[PDB]
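pls ignore typos typing on phone
K36 + seq
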Amino acid sequence: HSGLRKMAQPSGLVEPCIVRVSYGNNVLNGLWLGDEVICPRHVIASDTTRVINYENEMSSVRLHNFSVSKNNVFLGVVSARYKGVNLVLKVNQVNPNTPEHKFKSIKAGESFNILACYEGCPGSVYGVNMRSQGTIKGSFIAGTCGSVGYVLENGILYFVYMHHLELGNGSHVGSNFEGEMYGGYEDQPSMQLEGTNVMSSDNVVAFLYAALINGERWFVTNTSMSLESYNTWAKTNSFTELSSTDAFSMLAAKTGQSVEKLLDSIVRLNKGFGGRTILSYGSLCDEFTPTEVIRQMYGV
Ligand SMILES: *[C@H](O)[C@H](C[C@@H]1CCNC1=O)NC(=O)[C@H](CC(C)C)NC(=O)OCc1ccccc1
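k done
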């Protein structure tokens, strides 16, 4: 009974890039790469608790009003441009600890790492999973805007997320480094709603395989459901369509349960667990990808 737990990738490369950026009373995090610092543009808003006119804020932006710092290092701001909802600051000094990196976007249902930082101090690291609506269930609180999401893929560091805001339902909204807010959300204190959650089927199947590997089998019966039939069902029950079962071959082989037996399990279990649990959860979990589960269980 090893169980199943959300893991992060190490944060070592990312920590030395974090700086503190402030403008007026606002204080948040920046990402210092080469001679550039990146942070949410709302750092410039004179009042972030009411609707913001960003065209009017930028016009009155005076560079000298920025304070960017790390340790005893105070960076000078030589210029500042919007890149979508991200503010981009050319500073007078190159970050000697800049790692080799690239930028990419995260897709619905994919996992990545958060380094959560409080006004410049990196404080925690934990894995997250992008929800259907482009949000994540982070744990962001006051001071953590500009915290950074990243993934390591074959020895290559990708920066993928910059944190911006929290929705009424406790879901969290961020941007990629092209300055597009994931899910299209605006960077405003509008009482925006997330929209309905569509659970990732691939991920829920991964999670059920993890439970089987761990010796929990109650939710498997002597019935299965074909991919096509399951997809017809998921379109009308807030689940994603499953395009292929190839992703799960290893899990199916190791557990002797076909993906199709687990599609049947989802349809039954979505109506309720009947008092029982699965890896301690009393409801379906879609936070782990198939790949995440295979590496964690087998190290492939
Ligand atoms: C920036 O650090 C901050 C992070 C929020 C604060 C608490 N949890 C978070 O994720 N972002 C904002 O304060 C943001 C500003 C833009 C909308 C211009 N406003 C916001 O997120 O309001 C929602 C909220 C605020 C305070 C507590 C709970 C939700």
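The radius of gyration is 22 Å. The CA atoms of residues 52 and 122 lie 28 Å apart. more later
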